[PDB]
Write a protein that binds this ligand. Structure first.
Ligand code: CLA
Ligand code: CLA
Ligand code: CLA
Ligand code: CLA
Ligand code: CLA
Ligand code: CLA
Ligand code: CLA
Ligand code: LMG
Ligand code: KC1
Ligand code: DD6
Ligand code: BCR
Lengths: 98, 185, 125, 177, 168, 50
């Protein structure tokens, strides 16, 4: 997806594949690590202007799913309730109306 | 034989092999009477850093070549103005102390040199090979033949090395004397 | 011999450092270094970069590689390995290099007191 | 014959994220490689927003320094104190509320564009007035917008710094340095 | 250790010392000629330096500019070099001798090896082959000692303001 | 992928078929996709009348 044009090659052909890219970047070696957070570490063969984003990949759907977690829901509601109590106390102090 | 960075850059990167030459076949060793491969502490044996070292040597020589010419010209002409007059900054060396910090002159020079360096920094680390070390595409008076290109490359290095040493004497002699361009007592 | 330990470029790791690694690493682990062992990284890279393989690297990849290899000073020398191989031998042989507690620590008195008693399984002997 | 060399910095190859975008493949200025580390769409959105903000702010500073004022005695302040005086006056909070709702809509635009739910160009909000019909005309009009935005960004930076350094209205011609 | 150089051997209670606890010889074996040449030339100058500081206190050269008091070891240098002076007379002399060393070993000192180092060829006192080995170690052991001695002389004499043989 | 007529830089709100503002579909936040839009219409109409 994000490496639609990388000429990604396997360790077995480190010095065999030379066709560079749609750019002129040399082929990159893909190492299949067993870590789930880093399933594949890509190694370069030379100087290259490769676009490797440092930003994460978030989406609205799973951010909303995280905010739909019971902690976030029951923290937002209780925060709003406490804030409403504080605002009522500021606006109607000493419960004079009672 | 000066491959253009456009193509030369296709063989850039941290080379993991050894040319077998003195310093990966780099200019600067050929002396007058013959070869003068100098490195006595064996820094060039770390072949992975030879393109880096040549870049540092060229960068230092280029700064020193201007810097030595720097200490000469203020002693004979100064920018038209009172802040740079021969009475406000008598000797050239008392300029980093006078024109600096809140004054403005040196601070602006620091920023714009920083901007250039931060922009031309990707060439120093990436795109830097044993072939395009110090080459910033500014090849105007460069000869076309290979052997004459080596002479100009050798000419810059010898001048840069000389200015590096010459500037060292320039500030040291000036500071111990407080005297004009010929810093003799 | 082992394939990946031959003709390894000095740029990947120096000769003396590689010999120090091989000495520190147990012999049985040379063929297939385990994982998280400097020799594992040496194998995983020397099989990618070398004379017949990719001879160049990006500056950042080489920088990260140089921070994964040993820096020639974090490896035990021959005398230290002898110290360990003999200290463990003493401890397993039932003899203790005698030491005496001090100001938050202990001074080694340079004496081998035979520790296990006549009944080696007895706790009070 | 080799890398697509950047036109701005001739000794650095052009970043691949600068291909086919406005500005970009006429100068290709990115020596530090920010486009190599961040999404080009988000960078372009930020650049266009900054350009528009500066194009409004520069003209606002010009108008305020030259003497244009709203018909209220509460506005008889210099441009330097305009921010603090109006923050204490109230309208800055209201302006912030309005820019907040507009930026909520802009944030929705960014979220729905980056996720691909819509087909929005980075800085496009739909406004099509004085926009050339021909595709090359649209490209060069976007070029003009980018150039004017960058010029206004640098110009406003200089205007603010010079105005703070030397208490003086916009032209700064008299001054003393 | 360090070729066949005689720095070790005949060196105290142990026959051989071989003190190189940084490896400046193994790390740079091509410079063992240079290191000996430097070590010897350091010793000879230091020995003349220490024997220097003492003799001006009694006799002074007839140059008639050095024939003045108050020229101790903290001011003789900066005083003699003039607007040239005696210090240039010494420096020119040292140039004459040092030029001779260039001729014997070539311009680049290519002939400098691990056996001809610090051997200018002035043989008047030495005899035989084993004595030359014994005398070469006697040279260095005196030379290395005076190198530390004049080092202590210069530092202690100018810090504590002694300027004379006790240097205390 | 169509866009809303009202806010052309946002996707066209689904579930907003023709009720009144079907020509200017306006739901940036997306309550119609989160709630039963019949209830939303009832609330809007009661609010407007009140
Ligand atoms: C439903 C509960 C509730 C209600 C009705 C209000 C209402 C109000 N708050 Mg308030 N507030 C709340 C919860 C609430 N807040 C909570 C949970 C916090 C977290 C600490 C705050 C923190 C807060 C601050 C720090 C300030 C207000 C202020 C105000 C007043 C101006 C509106 C504003 O700034 O929005 C408040 C913003 C939020 C609620 C968003 C929080 C994120 C307004 C009367 C301001 C004020 O007094 O105006 C002069 C002000 O300075 N509030
Ligand atoms: C004695 C001074 C000297 C000499 C002989 C050179 C020589 C050279 N420089 Mg150089 N340079 C110098 C000083 C010098 N430089 C200084 C002081 C700076 C700092 C501003 C630079 C900055 C510089 C850059 C940024 C680049 C060069 C490059 C070059 C090479 C091609 C350009 C050329 O031939 O025109 C110089 C010939 C002259 C006669 C000009 C001298 C003017 C007095 C050439 C080997 C280019 C290169 O490496 O391409 C291969 C390149 O990109 N130089
Ligand atoms: C808020 C400031 C800002 C931002 C985010 C951008 C963003 C961008 N500019 Mg840009 N530019 C600006 C101000 C800005 N510009 C100004 C004031 C000028 C006038 C000198 C320019 C002149 C300019 C040129 C000439 C070019 C760009 C280009 C670009 C794009 C690629 C550059 C890059 O990697 O990011 C740049 C990231 C920053 C500037 C962040 C600031 C870093 C500091 C901390 C990118 C969309 C290139 C382009 O159009 O390709 C798409 C291009 O060729 N810019
Ligand atoms: C296109 C932008 C632009 C232009 C036309 C100028 C033009 C000028 N600047 Mg300026 N400047 C700029 C951007 C710009 N600057 C930026 C981005 C900064 C940094 C924020 C400055 C900071 C600056 C200072 C600090 C000073 C000037 C001064 C000047 C004047 C000399 C001149 C009219 C000087 C001036 O006007 O004298 C009072 C002066 O002192 N400029
Ligand atoms: C600058 C003075 C100097 C120099 C160049 C040398 C040079 C040498 N010494 Mg030496 N030495 C010196 C002072 C010096 N010494 C002093 C003052 C002492 C008395 C403590 C000794 C005691 C000594 C012993 C006991 C031995 C040597 C040996 C050697 C040789 C091999 C070791 C080596 O590489 O040293 C080079 C070291 C340096 C260049 C370091 C200089 C100081 C750094 C910068 C601090 C070499 C020719 C060995 C030898 O000859 O092998 C047979 C040997 O056994 N030296
Ligand atoms: C400043 C003191 C000084 C003095 C008096 C001399 C004197 C001499 N040098 Mg000399 N030299 C000096 C410093 C000095 N040198 C320095 C600083 C170096 C660099 C380290 C050399 C390197 C040097 C070489 C390489 C050679 C001489 C040679 C000579 C002799 C040639 C005679 C001549 O041309 O006279 C006018 C002469 C005895 C030549 C000689 O006789 O050696 C064979 C020779 O080839 N010199
Ligand atoms: C053969 C070598 C040698 C000897 C016998 C001494 C002997 C002495 N030193 Mg000494 N010293 C030496 C080398 C030596 N030093 C060197 C190489 C240095 C340079 C760091 C010094 C620096 C030094 C200082 C700074 C001082 C001495 C002092 C002393 C005296 C205590 C004593 C007479 C002390 C003193 O005042 O002397 C009386 C003192 O303060 N020494
Ligand atoms: C005020 C908050 C402002 C800070 C956030 C502003 C940038 C948000 C980034 C953004 O919206 O796009 C970043 C992401 C879009 O991210 C998209 O995610 C996709 C996942 O399938 C793919 O990875 C796409 O490549 C990626 O573009 O938008 C979000 O949905 C952000 C949610 C809100 C975050 C808060
Ligand atoms: C405190 C500072 C100090 C001084 C001042 C000093 C001095 C001399 N040491 Mg010495 N030394 C240490 C420190 C000092 N040594 C230490 C910490 C160690 C343990 C590693 C150590 C060990 C040895 C050995 C093994 C030998 C040796 C030598 C000499 C020597 C030569 C005399 C002569 O030969 O002319 C002189 C003058 C050789 C020998 O001859 O000792 C008589 C030799 O074999 N040293
Ligand atoms: C910033 C600042 C200041 C400053 C400053 C600065 C920048 C000071 C810089 C000082 C600097 C740059 C000092 C370099 C010395 C280089 C030396 C000594 C090289 C020697 C090299 C030697 C002795 C040997 C050389 C050779 O052996 C070689 C290598 C090969 C042989 O074949 C030939 C020979 C034997 C000859 C002020 C202005 C002073 C005051 C102000 O307030 C604050
Ligand atoms: C920031 C941070 C930090 C800190 C933290 C803290 C320290 C916190 C605290 C917090 C807190 C400590 C808070 C508190 C709060 C309080 C409140 C919020 C209150 C409330 C109250 C209420 C709510 C009440 C109510 C009522 C009334 C009034 C009447 C009726 C009845 C009742 C009782 C209900 C740190 C550094 C660590 C880290 C980083 C981050």
């Amino acid at each position: 997806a994000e490496t639609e044009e990388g000429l990604i090659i396997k360790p077995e052909e480190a010095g065999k594949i030379t066709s560079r890219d749609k750019n002129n970047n040399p082929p990159r070696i893909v190492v299949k690590t067993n870590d789930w957070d880093i399933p594949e570490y890509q190694l370069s063969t030379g100087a290259s202007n490769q676009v490797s984003y440092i930003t994460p990949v978030v989406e609205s759907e799973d951010i909303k799913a995280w905010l739909s977690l019971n902690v976030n829901f029951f923290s937002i509601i209780i925060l709003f309730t406490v804030g409403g109590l504080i605002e009522i106390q500021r606006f109607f102090p000493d419960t004079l109306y009672w | 034989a000066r491959r253009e960075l456009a193509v030369a850059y296709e063989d850039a990167g941290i080379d993991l092999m050894d040319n077998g030459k003195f310093a990966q076949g780099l200019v600067g060793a050929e002396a007058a009477f013959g070869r003068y491969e100098f490195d006595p502490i064996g820094f060039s044996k770390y072949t992975e850093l030879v393109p880096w070292f040549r870049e540092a040597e060229l960068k230092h020589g280029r700064i020193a070549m201007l810097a030595w010419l720097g200490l000469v010209v203020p002693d004979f002409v100064r920018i038209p103005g009172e802040a740079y007059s021969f009475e406000a900054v008598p000797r050239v060396i008392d300029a980093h102390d006078a024109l600096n910090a809140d004054a403005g002159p040196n601070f602006q020079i620091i920023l714009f040199i920083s901007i250039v360096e931060l922009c031309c920094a990707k060439k120093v680390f990436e795109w830097n090979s044993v072939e395009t070390a110090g080459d910033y595409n500014l090849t105007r008076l460069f000869p076309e033949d290979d052997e004459a290109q080596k002479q100009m490359r050798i000419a810059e290095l010898k001048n840069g090395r000389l200015a590096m040493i010459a500037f060292g004497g320039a500030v040291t002699q000036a500071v111990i004397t407080g005297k004009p361009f010929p810093w003799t007592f | 011999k082992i394939a990946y330990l031959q003709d390894i470029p000095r740029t990947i790791v120096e000769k003396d450092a590689l010999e120090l690694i091989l000495k520190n690493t147990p012999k049985e682990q040379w063929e297939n270094p385990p994982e998280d062992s400097y020799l594992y990284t040496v194998k995983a890279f020397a099989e990618m970069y070398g004379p017949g393989k990719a001879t160049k690297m990006g500056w950042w990849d080489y920088y990260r590689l140089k921070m994964d290899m040993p820096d020639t000073t974090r490896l035990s020398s021959e005398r230290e390995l002898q110290e360990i191989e003999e200290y463990e031998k003493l401890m397993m042989s039932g003899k203790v290099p005698f030491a005496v507690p001090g100001p938050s620590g202990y001074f080694f008195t340079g004496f081998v007191t035979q520790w296990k008693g006549k009944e080696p399984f007895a706790g009070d002997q | 014959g080799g890398y697509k060399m950047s036109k701005a910095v001739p000794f650095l190859p052009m970043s691949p994220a600068l291909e086919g975008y406005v500005g970009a493949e006429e100068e290709g200025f990115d020596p530090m490689g920010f486009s190599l580390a961040l999404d080009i769409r988000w960078l372009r959105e930020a650049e266009l927003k900054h350009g528009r903000i500066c194009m409004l702010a520069t003209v606002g500073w010009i108008a305020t320094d030259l003497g244009m004022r709203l018909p209220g005695p509460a506005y008889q302040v210099s441009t330097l104190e305009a921010h603090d005086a109006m923050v204490k006056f109230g309208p800055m909070a209201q302006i912030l509320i309005w820019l907040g709702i507009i930026e909520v809509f802009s944030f929705l635009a960014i979220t729905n564009m980056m996720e691909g739910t819509t087909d929005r160009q980075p800085g496009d909000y739909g406004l099509r007035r004085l926009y050339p019909k021909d595709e090359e005309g649209q490209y060069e009009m976007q070029l003009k917008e980018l150039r004017n935005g960058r010029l206004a960004m640098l110009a406003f930076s200089g205007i603010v710094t010079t105005a703070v350094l030397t208490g003086r209205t916009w032209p700064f011609x008299x001054x003393x340095x | 250790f360090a070729g066949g150089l005689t720095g070790s051997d005949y060196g105290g209670f142990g026959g051989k010392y071989e003190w190189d606890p940084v490896g400046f010889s193994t790390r740079w074996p091509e410079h063992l000629a240079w290191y000996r040449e430097a070590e010897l030339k350091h010793g000879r100058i230091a020995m003349l330096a220490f024997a220097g500081l003492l003799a001006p206190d009694l006799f002074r050269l007839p140059w008639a500019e050095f024939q003045d008091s108050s020229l101790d070891f903290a001011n003789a240098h900066d005083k003699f070099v003039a607007g040239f002076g005696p210090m240039w007379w010494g420096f020119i002399a040292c140039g004459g001798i040092e030029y001779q060393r260039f001729r014997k070993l070539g311009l680049g000192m290519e002939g400098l090896t691990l056996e001809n180092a610090g051997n200018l060829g002035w043989f008047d006192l030495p005899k035989n082959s084993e004595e030359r080995l014994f005398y070469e170690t006697a040279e260095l052991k005196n030379g290395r000692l005076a190198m530390l001695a004049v080092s202590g002389i210069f530092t202690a004499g100018i810090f504590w303001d002694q300027h004379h043989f006790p240097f205390i | 992928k169509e866009t809303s007529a009202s806010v052309p830089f946002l996707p066209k709100p689904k579930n907003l078929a023709g009720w009144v503002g079907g020509e200017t579909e306006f739901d940036p936040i997306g309550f119609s996709n989160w709630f039963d839009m019949k209830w939303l219409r009832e609330a809007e109409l009661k609010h407007g009348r009140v």
